[PDB]
Design an enzyme around this catalytic site. Structure first.
Site, PDB file in Angstrom:
ATOM      1  N   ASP A 165       0.805  -1.043  -0.022  1.00 40.87           N
ATOM      2  CA  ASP A 165       0.072  -0.071   0.069  1.00 40.87           C
ATOM      3  C   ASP A 165       0.833   1.301  -0.084  1.00 40.87           C
ATOM      4  O   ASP A 165       1.853   1.383   0.515  1.00 40.87           O
ATOM      5  CB  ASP A 165      -0.861  -0.107   1.351  1.00 40.87           C
ATOM      6  N   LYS A 189       4.517   2.869  -3.693  1.00 40.91           N
ATOM      7  CA  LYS A 189       4.706   2.000  -4.768  1.00 40.91           C
ATOM      8  C   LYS A 189       6.219   1.775  -5.069  1.00 40.91           C
ATOM      9  O   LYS A 189       6.196   0.488  -5.702  1.00 40.91           O
ATOM     10  CB  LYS A 189       3.744   2.343  -6.004  1.00 40.91           C
ATOM     11  N   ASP A 205      -1.783  -2.090  -4.279  1.00 38.07           N
ATOM     12  CA  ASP A 205      -2.711  -1.037  -4.535  1.00 38.07           C
ATOM     13  C   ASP A 205      -2.128  -0.114  -5.559  1.00 38.07           C
ATOM     14  O   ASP A 205      -0.801   0.099  -5.347  1.00 38.07           O
ATOM     15  CB  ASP A 205      -3.147  -0.177  -3.243  1.00 38.07           C
ATOM     16  N   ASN A 206      -2.712   0.748  -6.240  1.00 39.32           N
ATOM     17  CA  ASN A 206      -2.246   2.004  -7.156  1.00 39.32           C
ATOM     18  C   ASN A 206      -1.270   1.403  -8.157  1.00 39.32           C
ATOM     19  O   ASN A 206      -0.140   2.227  -8.259  1.00 39.32           O
ATOM     20  CB  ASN A 206      -1.871   2.924  -6.095  1.00 39.32           C
ATOM     21  N   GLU A 232     -18.161   4.657 -11.727  1.00 42.35           N
ATOM     22  CA  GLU A 232     -19.250   4.732 -12.753  1.00 42.35           C
ATOM     23  C   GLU A 232     -18.689   5.316 -14.057  1.00 42.35           C
ATOM     24  O   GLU A 232     -19.539   5.361 -15.073  1.00 42.35           O
ATOM     25  CB  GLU A 232     -20.349   5.682 -12.239  1.00 42.35           C
TER      26      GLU A 232
HETATM   27 CL   LIG Z   1      -4.087   3.859   5.052  1.00 39.98          CL
END
Ligand SMILES: [Cl-]
Ligand SMILES: [Cl-]
Ligand code: NA
Length: 213
Positions: free
Chosen positions: A138, A141, A166-167, A196
């Site tokens: 997390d 990166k 993540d990311n 969306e």
């Molecule tokens: Cl966090």
């Protein structure tokens, strides 16, 4: 006051003590409002939940923490006896993460380790870790690849250990995606969350370790 301090203050002022869902919603609301992170609950939280439910880990390692959102998200799902280890170099972020978990009532599920992963991953054996069931990578990166290598070299991964990062929307350097995909030791799945819209909001990589070669 730092962003992370303000996130904590907002939780303290608006969320219900001992209610992880209320804490997550309060963080998500304030960050979306301030345009710091858009609906983290839908973009990354639901994937985190489904991976944890899918693999039911007993021991999770979180590499990197900022305000405790991810730690609350994960710890709230762990069964009795299952535990989260959260490793973070920045003591201010670790302190906010601790207070966020205390507020949520989840402190007894988590051990926070404050220090550099290069120093602490080789010491995880001292926390009674044989192998990890899941690793959540997390925030920072550029650590994903070197941390993955350290975990491998310290024997902390077993066949079936799940890494979730993540990311990972764009390639960076060090290139974690190229490493886990290229290596026949990892079976990989990429997740792209669009909410969306037509543009990726968050991207995650699941890499399942196939065992030491
Ligand atoms: Cl966090
Ligand atoms: Cl699932
Ligand atoms: Na691979």
């Amino acid at each position: 006051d730092t962003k992370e301090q303000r996130i904590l203050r907002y939780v303290q002022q608006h969320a219900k003590p001992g209610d992880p869902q209320s804490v997550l919603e309060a963080i998500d609301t304030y960050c979306t409002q301030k345009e710091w992170a858009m609906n983290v609950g839908d973009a990354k939280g639901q994937i985190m939940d489904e991976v944890i439910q899918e693999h039911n880990p007993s021991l999770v390692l979180e590499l990197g923490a900022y305000c405790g959102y991810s730690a609350v998200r994960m710890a709230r799902l762990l069964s009795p006896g299952a535990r989260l280890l959260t490793m973070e170099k920045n003591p201010d972020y670790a302190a906010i993460t601790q207070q966020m978990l205390n507020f949520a009532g989840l402190q007894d599920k988590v051990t926070i380790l404050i220090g550099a992963s290069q120093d602490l991953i080789p010491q995880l054996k001292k926390y009674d870790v044989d192998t990890l069931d899941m690793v959540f990578l997390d925030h920072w990166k550029d650590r994903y690849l070197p941390d993955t290598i350290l975990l491998e070299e310290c024997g902390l991964l077993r066949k079936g250990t799940v890494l979730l990062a993540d990311n990972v929307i764009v390639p960076g350097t060090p290139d974690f995606l190229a490493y886990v995909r290229g290596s026949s030791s990892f079976e990989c799945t990429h997740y792209s969350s669009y909410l969306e819209y037509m543009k990726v909001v968050d991207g995650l990589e699941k890499a399942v370790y196939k065992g030491p070669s």
